[PDB]
RNA sequence: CCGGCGUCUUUUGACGAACAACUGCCCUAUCAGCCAGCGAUGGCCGUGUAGUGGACUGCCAUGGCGUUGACGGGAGCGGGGGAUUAGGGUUCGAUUCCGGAGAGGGAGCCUGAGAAAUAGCUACCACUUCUACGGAGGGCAGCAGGCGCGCAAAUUGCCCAAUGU
RNA sequence: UCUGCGCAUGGCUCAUUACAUCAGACGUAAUCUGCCGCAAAAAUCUUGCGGUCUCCGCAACAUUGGAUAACUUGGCGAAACGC
C-alpha cells in the first residue's frame, strides 16, 4: 500500500530508480489521525510491535502543567489560537504538537490559593517565590495559553505544558 | 524572561528542548548570554567543544553540541566544495585507486553533502573533520566535528 | 526466521564431513551464539558415542539422564558454549568444556566440587528497578546484587550448587588470561599491556609463557586466575602454548615410530 | 417451500409442506427473518400458533 | 509433605527482522548536459512509521550532480568459485554454498513476533476446467509425468533405515 | 472435534536489475523480536453462612459464572475443500 521509500524518486544526479522488488509491509505509511475538539473516540490500530497504538480522535480534554513550580492538573481545551504549520488546521481546532491552546485554567487558580498548621507553610511559600505579569492577568480572568508537548494522534492522550514569559512573549505577539 | 529576537525568525519560535532556557529570572540579567541557561555536550573522542556551543544563543537541534545527536563509527575527512544552502556545506574527499594490470593508481573523488553546525563556517579550500550521526536529511549524514 | 541449517554453512569445529547427511542442526537459541556453540546430539554422537544416530540422541536426553549446569535436560538441542560444566551421572563423569590449543573443542575431566564452579564474563552492568544493580554476562545470565568494584569485561566465580557470586576476578594489570574466538584460541598467558583506541576496538597486547608476545582484542580477553598458581579451574590438554609448524610435524613421525 | 418446525427445549423437529397456493394468497415481500408470523398465514394445521 | 509440567505481565542475552554507509564493479559520446508545475538540494514546524529520514503535508531558502563520464541505451541476478596461462593476464559464473528477488501478468488485504505469503485471501486482465447452464472452480519456476519449443537433456519407481525439520 | 503450536523455514526457478544487488569492513545512543536461557513479581476487598434494608455480624486449602464443536434432530443444493 502506502510506503516509506527513496525507491519511487530521483537521485542528487536527477536519475531515476528503477525496481527489480515489490514493496514490503515493513514499509509502511497510514493515514493521518485527526484530533480536534469534541466527544472522545479512540479507535486502535494494531502495530508490528505486536501492541496496540491509539488514535486520537476529537479529545477535548488534556493533562496541562505548569512550569516550574512542577505540578499539573487536568483541564478542559476550548480553541486552538496558532500554530506554526498552518492557519487552515487552527480553524478546524485540530490538535497536533505544538500548537498553542487555550485551557478552563480553573484548577491552577485553586491550586495556587494553596501553594493552622497549614498557614505557616503558606507564608514560607509566598517568600522567594514571583510569577510572571502576563500569566497573572490571564491566570486571573480564568484562561491561559499553554502549548500541547506530546503527540495526540499516536497516544490518543494530550498532554501540555503551559507557557513562561520568554516564550509566552512571543506566541502573544504573533497573534 | 524575555524574547532575543536576533534570533527568531520563525512561525514557530524555537527553544531548546534538552533544558528549560524559559525561565524567567534576573539572573539572565547584565550578562551577554554566559548565565543564560545552555546544554553542553563533550564529544569523547578527542574532539574538544568550542566556546560557542557552551555560552552562545543558537538553537539546533542538528548538532551533537546543543542537541541528543551523537557521533559513532565513522569519521572522515574533506575539503570545502561550496558553502551553499543553509546549515548544510558540500564536502568533497579524494583519494587514490589502483588497478593491478597497468600497476598505477588515479584520483576519484566522493562530492557529499554534510549539515555544518552554525557554530561553524569554514571557508572554500579549508579542511573540514565530519563524524557518523543519524539520517538528517535524504543525503545528509554527517556533521561537522571540528574545522582547521 | 532460520530454522534450517546446512553442514558446510555449519562450523567445521564441529568436525563435520562434506559427504554424508545435507543438513546440520541448527541449535534453539540460548546462553551462546551459533558460530560458539556446539549442540548436543553432536557431542554425543560424535565424540562420546553413547550414540551411533540422531533418533538415539533424543532417547537419552528427552528422558533425561544428562545435565548442564546442575539442572536436567529434556531438551534435545540446546547450545553448549564455553565454561559449561555438563554431567551424566549415570556414567559419574563430569566434562567441563574449554578452547584447546589450535581452535578445538576441549573437553576436560574434573574433580566433582570442581564441577560446581563456574566462570562467567560480565558483560554489561546496569542498575535496574528498585535500585537493584545486575550484571549481564556472556551467558546472558542476571547476577543479581554484584559487588561495588564490578566493571565490564571481569569474571565472577560462580556456584552452581546453589546460586550466588563468590568473589570477582578483575582483568586489570598481568594476570593469568586466555583468549575466545580470534583464532588464537585456547592459548594462555599474561596481560603484557592493554591499549585503547576510542570508537574502535581496544587491542590488547598478550605474552605467554617462554615468550613469544602477539595481539588479540579486548572483547576476545576471558580472565581465568589471579597467576597460573591461582587458577579456579584446570587446562586443556596442551597448556596454552603452541608450537611451531616443524615441530608439529616432526613429533607426529616420532610417535609413529611405535 | 416447505417447513421445517421445532418446538425449543425439547429438541423435536419435523418437516412439515406447505402448497403454493396458500403462498400465493398471503404476501412473501411483508415477511423476513425475525418476524414473527401467526399460524392463519400458512394455510393452517398451524392455527393459534405464533 | 514433596516432585515434574503449564500460563499472564515485566526484564535482557540469544536466534533473526528492518534501515543506513565506507570501498570496489561490463560495453557505448554517431548518448552531454541532467534535476524542481505534481520534491529536485537544503533549512524550519509538524504528520507518519517499530524507528531514523522530503518518507510525507505546510512554510521558507536556491540549490544538487557532470569529461575523475553524469544522464540515456545495449548485454547481465551478485559473490565464493570454474576453464586456460611460465609470469602478467584472458575468459566463464543458469547451476549444489552464501546473499537478493519471483511463483501466469499486476495491485490491494487479513492473520501473525515475523508475510504485502500465493499448494492464504480479494479484484482486474491474459488463459483455463466442471455444470440437468440456477451456479461452481483452476495457477507445476515443488517431485514424477504430458503437450509445445529448440541442435539439446531421465522413472507417473522404492523408503523415512540414514541426514534434518 | 474444540484448544495450543508450526506451516513466512526447507524445495524450485533467474524475469526484472548498474549509486540497484552483492562482497569485504562498519553503525543502528534510530528500532522490533514468538519459541529458547538466566531471571524478576507485596497494587487488587473476595468467598461462604446467619439475621437483615440494597445493612451488619461472624467464618476463611476461594466454595466463580455463562456458551460452543464433535454428537442428536429436521435439512437444503445439479454439483461445490458449498451451506
Known sequence: ?????????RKITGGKTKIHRKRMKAELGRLPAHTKLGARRVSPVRARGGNFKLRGLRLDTGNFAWSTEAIA????????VYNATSNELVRTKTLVKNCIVVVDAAPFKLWYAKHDELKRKWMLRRENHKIEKAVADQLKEGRLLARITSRPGQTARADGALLEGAELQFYLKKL | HSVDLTLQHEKAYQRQTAVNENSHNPN??????????????????????????????????????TSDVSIRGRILRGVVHSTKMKRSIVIRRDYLH??????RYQKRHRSLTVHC????????????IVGQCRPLSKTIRYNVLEVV | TKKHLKRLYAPKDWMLSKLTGVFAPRPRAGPHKLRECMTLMIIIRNRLKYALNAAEAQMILRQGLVCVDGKPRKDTKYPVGFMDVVEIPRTGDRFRILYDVKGRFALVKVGEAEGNIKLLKVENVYTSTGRIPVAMTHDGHRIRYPDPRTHRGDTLVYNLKEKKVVDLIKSSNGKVVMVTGGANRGRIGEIMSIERHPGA??????????????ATRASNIFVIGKDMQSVPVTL??????RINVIQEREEKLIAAEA | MKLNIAYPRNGTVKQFEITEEVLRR??????????????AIFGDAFRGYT
Not at chain 2, 555536550?41 to 537541534?61: E, M, W
Not at chain 2, 589502483?98 to 600497476?103: C, G, H, L, N, V
Request: proline share 6%; glycine share 10%; aromatic share 10%.
Open chain 1, 1 to 9: 500500500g502506502i510506503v516509506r521509500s527513496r525507491l519511487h524518486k
Open chain 1, 73 to 80: 492538573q487536568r483541564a478542559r481545551i476550548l480553541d486552538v
Open chain 2, 28 to 65: 539572565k540579567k547584565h550578562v551577554n548570554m554566559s548565565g543564560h541557561i545552555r546544554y553542553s555536550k563533550k564529544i569523547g573522542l578527542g574532539f574538544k567543544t568550542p566556546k560557542s556551543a557552551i555560552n552562545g544563543k543558537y538553537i539546533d537541534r542538528k548538532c551533537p553540541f
Open chain 2, 98 to 103: 589502483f588497478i593491478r594490470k597497468y600497476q
Open chain 2, 117 to 128: 553546525s552554525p557554530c561553524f563556517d569554514p571557508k572554500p579550500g579549508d579542511e573540514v
Open chain 3, 201 to 214: 576496538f581496544d587491542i590488547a597486547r598478550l605474552k605467554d609463557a617462554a615468550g613469544h608476545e602477539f
Open chain 3, 236 to 241: 586443556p590438554k596442551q597448556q596454552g602454548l
Open chain 4, 26 to 39: 398471503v404476501s412473501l415481500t411483508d415477511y423476513r427473518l425475525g418476524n414473527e408470523v401467526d399460524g
